[PDB]
Design a protein around this ligand. Structure first.
Ligand SMILES: CCCCCCCC/C=C\CCCCCCCC(=O)O[C@H](COC(=O)CCCCCCCCCCCCCCC)COP(=O)([O-])OCC[N+](C)(C)C
Ligand SMILES: CCCCCCCC/C=C\CCCCCCCC(=O)O[C@H](COC(=O)CCCCCCCCCCCCCCC)COP(=O)([O-])OCC[N+](C)(C)C
Ligand SMILES: CC(C)C(=O)OC[C@H]1O[C@@H](n2ccc(NO)nc2=O)[C@H](O)[C@@H]1O
Ligand SMILES: CC(C)C(=O)OC[C@H]1O[C@@H](n2ccc(NO)nc2=O)[C@H](O)[C@@H]1O
Ligand SMILES: CC(C)C(=O)OC[C@H]1O[C@@H](n2ccc(NO)nc2=O)[C@H](O)[C@@H]1O
Lengths: 533, 533, 533
């Protein structure tokens, strides 16, 4: 077999050239396919052409930025020097212009829309003031991140709610995610028979979790997920000035759960300051996981609002964390270390898919068991409360009434009208005490009732609420911040960073509160821009 | 900022006094609410008044006992000294009086009741003698625990079975337990849809286990369950004289499963002697968990008899363990250490509920898999036995037919009549070879047949059996002693105390037999006290 | 007291005699039962009499072989010495005779049958040559385990396929295996209700796996499975010249799953050489457990073909592994140690049954999760492929269409005619990418379409394929080689022998391919001996 050995040696000598040639040939074939499809009918082949164009543009941009970073910085330095020199008066000029513009927008637009939007703006101010008052170090507060976070949220709201392009873009994206979630039905139908719809939750909503986890793992292996994470994290880091580790964690948490978000930066956990740890936990609690987005979309919640709230919850988390537990130490991690994310230990794509699918057994089992236990407890609590209230000739007392009369101020400050604040209060209580899925199931119930068109009031009891209150509740409920999630978080952050355990338990509770406040802040900005039908 | 710190310092300085005043104010407010409810009506509000009064009595008694312990001991000491001084001659008088009393009670009551009751007494003597003969160390036997355990069982049975208020109270307790455990359906309907009734066992009974684990974890956290466990264990420790750790475990096993009961003394498990480990295993095997008690009462099994058997098994299990495997070494665990129980890791109530719910996944999976395997084996064994018995023109041969003749003597000695002894023996075989759920299902079928009415003998076969034999079967079947369940217990304990892996396996097989005989002793006593229809 | 000790001492002294008497009495009772059964009616008792005669014959044979081994070796040695003395020249005569017989058989038999069988023989030659060409160490290959492996495959296929009694015996065995596995359904009807048929896969098919696991655990404890495994493995070890441990594993894999097969030699697993590990992984990938035999016979696949396919894949895996990755170093496992399989530690039969049943939870959960994930990915891929194909006016493009043209040559070489090669290719692709369950489901549909009748081509698409192509596809698909099943194999082997984790992952992929080629070999021979309908 001498000839085989000689050929093997020759291939090893020029393996790189052969690989490059093969990849170029494949790329040429793909481009030929795309151009042929365009030739046959450009109108029908538009989406493929658009995808190809954007991919090529992004690849070229990345290559050019990698090649000429130093030269770009050298070119841009003189303008930075001039601006730094003129800052002493430019800062006053810019702040005055910003205040004038904000006042003009408030007066004109908000007054035109109505009183509720103005109340929402007031509620935003009140939330920021209160979270400032109970801040860990009120004196040692750095105000750049807070204002930049609120500004980013407001700009995202303006782009996505008050503009045709962004609104249509996010509607299309939500429709695509809804269409994508329908493919797990094939596997669920195979495994659980054609009657899997008889037990809707266990046999239809959990397979969605499994499929989304698998595809998420595959994407993380390929490297697209890290690409998007870096792209958003650079924007947040440049504009807000937060530390690289917390910024990357907040960017990554838009797609990942609270427990599996910190793993993006494992090695540097022991070396993070207290503020960065608290910011990590807050960003964990104030956003949801893309894997369970399918479950909420299944139940009739608006996918566009879910996506927009998830996008807007990162600046909110960072701003509220910086305000609540400000930085009083010197960060140790640098940008290069933080941006580098240690990929998983997967040999090939199919090993990644298998690992991702197998990892979700514990997720689904715990989800089901927790739902059973929590709803049984809820029914028992309702029965006991009714029994106790029957003593005073008031057998209607229940968890719902207490939640309605307890969380009313929070729902009102967000800008919900007086009548619907009580229903939003019930939803907020559901989210706070039980996981956010019960609350989203009841929101699905209410939105379905409104869509059916039945009578609004029956026996002096309101049945449904407006579209605006539904949007505000959609924004306010988009988070994992509930008491049950507290312990499971602490353990996780102790597992990765045992040496910091004494610190974690110190801030965990504070982090959870910040999480909810973050959600509320987004809802306020949602409430300030939506108009009354 | 400084003002906030000053206010916090001021609160901290008076933190104890202000906090105590606030909690007392809340308690006084609750008392005022109770008073208001009683004022509104005295019939509807009666149970709340009763529960409040009993709680006040117990808290007052507990605090008074704690404060004045030394005075009580000082007052008690002289009487104990006098009794010890005169015991040398008083012991014979006491023993003679007890023997005279038992003889008089037997010859009057049991002779009036009938011969079958006297056969139960004979069977009790036979079971105790057989336990003594096949004992690990017959020479080194401590007789006080045996006599005291049998006396406690007899006294409890005489108090409950032969007293109408006791019977009524225990029936009411069982009904409350059933109604409370019926709330799991609220969570099971949500998770498994409105069609959860279609797959009865899979989607109704296992949620009961999950919910019971959740509630039990919550109660262990709050510290309520440990209170009753200590109070019940104290009387056993004082009267029988068993060691503190085994008394605590035996008391805990009344309403906790065999798998979870040793967790009460988990820290001290490695230091337990062999005898105490055998007693732990036996006490676990003899008693059933509270979760299954909800299901069984639904099947038609008497509630009063189920509760009485569960309570009576603990003294029987301890007495049989002390007789079967007597202790021959000095214990190394103090009463204060053993009685004290501390929660592992539960930050708040909801973390405790979540952990309690997540701990039951392995339990439910193992239960389901063992049922599938063992019932498939039963079907195969029946088909093979019929095939083999077809050679002799007896195709009726099956598992039940052979078990009927194999286990007849135990049923006969327990007190059951001759004709019904075979019917009871079939159930005893079902319980010994398969979980108790199947045996209780068959017993419920027989109870339903008896209640509906009809011919006693449709043909040579007998349809149903008397009420007394159903009571005796209800007592004799109340245990977890199965061949199939022997494995997981060995798996369960070794995890808590791996260091004792050698010893755990040594005494498991004898612990299973001690549990079965413990069940049979309680059945013998129940058959002694019951009267023929 | 002392008398009991004296009796115990006497019992200890006479324990051997007591055990011998007990077993003699039991055997005599069994023989008396058999005699009575035969006397009463011989026709009814025939199957029991035959089983008794076979059992007693094997017991006597084993006793004679064990006791009189030395004399047998003494009588055999001189003949072996003479054979070795003459072998230097006898070698060429034996080889020439074998080649001449092969040529005469090929001319006289296959040529009469038709072209396709000759092509299948060519395909067998091509597959063996290709395996040799892409070999880890082509220069150092031992050719005994290839020629002998193919010889054993051909001989067994000839006996089973070209003789009616063998075909009928294997069909009967398949029917019995189906009947025996049928009891799992009756055992799972209790747990999953009477409506378990509604969810066919999850509820009917998995309990089959649980029942098979518990049954095989029982048999491993008793020791019949080990007896059969040794008996079969010795035939391979003496003839092919393979090592002991890998021969034992290959012989055990005939009726044991890939995950549970290494447990036979688990204690010696870390010391196995690299080639022995490769042959331990290949032999798993080319055989199906007995649990799926019942399901596949239920689908309508021929039972004789399934059993013959497994038995023939047993030698083929070893032959292909030895040609693919030849052994390069001396093994360190003795035959005596390798053959001995340590019995289960379970105290009694039911403990071992419980352990075996518990072990299967992970397996069933992983099967369900992987099926859901992979079928979802398949649906998404089909949608994407149709979307892409629509651009070129070809909306029919799908996974099946691509597989039909990708895998056609493999189907053609096996002997399938031209038109049916594409249909076989679709099944081959389904089996390679997803588990063989779906491939056999499609094959069952294709069998049923033929059995029902109807037009061969309802349109330009063929509905069903010939019977011979169904037999060839039955042989080709009988394996566990999947891209999704590689992960669990690696996870199991690393867990059993962590020390070798570096090597296992190195040798997994080459094993998977070596699995499929082995299956193809079993098909080629099956294609070579089968006459067209
Ligand atoms: C009205 C909504 C406005 C929403 C945005 C509101 C606010 C976003 C801007 C937040 C500014 C916080 C400054 C506080 C601070 O100390 O930072 C200092 C730096 O400050 C800067 O250099 C940043 C200057 C950015 C201003 C221009 C962008 C706005 C364009 C919006 C145009 C949108 C038009 C919309 C038309 C419909 C600290 O510097 P350092 O100590 O050296 O570190
Ligand atoms: C068509 C039917 C085909 C039927 C059987 C085909 C079996 C062919 C086996 C050929 C292997 C040759 C080989 O390895 O040389 C030697 C063995 O040679 C033998 O002794 C094998 C002879 C077996 C013939 C019995 C037929 C029944 C190997 O020498 P070694 O390396 O020292 O070990
Ligand atoms: C998904 C639907 C059916 C649902 O009801 O889920 C309830 C709870 O599931 C937790 N969860 C989920 C995903 C994740 N990472 O992907 N981490 C989590 O913690 C999270 O607390 C939520 O409330
Ligand atoms: C389906 C259930 C109710 C059942 O039939 O029980 C049979 C076996 O289930 C074990 N078991 C059950 C409940 C429990 N706590 O509620 N702890 C346990 O250990 C126990 O070993 C017994 O043998
Ligand atoms: C639903 C079941 C019966 C099935 O169709 O199996 C598909 C995949 O499940 C693996 N499997 C299965 C059974 C077993 N022992 O009984 N060992 C295994 O490894 C194996 O990888 C195969 O590909």
């Amino acid at each position: 077999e001498r000839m085989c050995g000689r050929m093997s040696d020759f291939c090893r000598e020029h393996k790189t050239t052969l690989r490059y040639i093969i990849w170029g040939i494949l790329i040429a074939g793909y481009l030929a396919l795309v151009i042929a499809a365009c030739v046959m009918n450009f109108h029908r082949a538009l989406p493929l052409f658009v995808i190809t164009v954007v991919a090529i543009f992004f690849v070229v941009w990345d290559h050019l930025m990698a090649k000429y970073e130093s030269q770009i910085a050298r070119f841009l330095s003189p303008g930075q020097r001039l601006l730094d020199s003129h800052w002493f008066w430019l800062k006053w000029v810019i702040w005055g212009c910003l205040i004038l513009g904000v006042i003009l927008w408030l007066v004109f637009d908000t007054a035109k829309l109505g009183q509720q939007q103005l109340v929402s703006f007031g509620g935003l101010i009140i939330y920021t003031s209160l979270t400032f008052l109970f801040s860990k170090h009120p004196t040692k507060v750095y105000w750049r991140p807070v204002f930049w976070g609120i500004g980013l949220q407001f700009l995202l709201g303006l782009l996505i709610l008050r503009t045709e392009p962004g609104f249509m873009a996010f509607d299309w994206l939500g429709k695509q995610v809804q269409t994508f979630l329908g493919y797990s039905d094939a596997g669920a139908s195979f495994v659980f028979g054609e009657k899997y719809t008889d037990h809707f939750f266990a046999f239809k909503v959990l397979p969605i979790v499994i499929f989304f986890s698998t595809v998420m793992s595959m994407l993380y292996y390929l490297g697209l997920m890290q690409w998007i994470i870096r792209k958003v994290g650079w924007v947040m880091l440049v504009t807000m000035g937060t530390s690289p580790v917390e910024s990357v964690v907040a960017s990554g948490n838009i797609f990942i759960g609270q427990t599996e978000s910190p793993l993006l930066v494992r090695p540097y956990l022991p070396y993070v300051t207290k503020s960065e740890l608290h910011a990590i936990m807050t960003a964990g609690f104030s956003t949801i996981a893309g894997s369970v987005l399918g479950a909420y979309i299944s139940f009739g919640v608006s996918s566009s609002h879910l996506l927009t709230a998830s996008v807007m919850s990162a600046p909110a988390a960072l701003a509220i964390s910086k305000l609540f537990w400000p930085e009083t130490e010197t960060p140790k991690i640098n940008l290069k270390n933080a941006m580098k994310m240690e990929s998983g230990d997967s040999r090939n794509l199919l090993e990644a898919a298998t690992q991702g699918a197998s990892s979700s057994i514990s997720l689904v089992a715990n989800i089901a068991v927790n739902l059973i236990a929590f709803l049984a407890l809820l029914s028992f609590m309702n029965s006991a409360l009714s029994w106790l209230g029957n003593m005073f000739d008031y057998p209607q007392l229940s968890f719902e009434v207490i939640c309605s009369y307890v969380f009313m101020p929070f729902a009102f400050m967000m800008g919900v009208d007086w009548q619907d604040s009580f229903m939003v209060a019930k939803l907020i209580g559901y989210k706070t005490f039980f996981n956010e899925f019960v609350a989203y199931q009841q929101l699905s119930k209410l939105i379905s009732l409104r869509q059916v068109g039945g009578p609004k009031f029956v026996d002096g009891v309101q049945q449904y609420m407006s579209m605006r209150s539904e949007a505000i509740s959609t924004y306010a409920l988009c988070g994992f911040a509930n008491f049950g999630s507290l312990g499971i978080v602490i353990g996780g952050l102790t597992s990765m960073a045992p040496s910091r355990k004494r610190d974690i338990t110190a801030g965990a509770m504070r982090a959870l509160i910040a999480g909810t406040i973050a959600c509320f802040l987004t809802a306020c900005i949602a409430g300030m821009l939506t108009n009354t039908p």
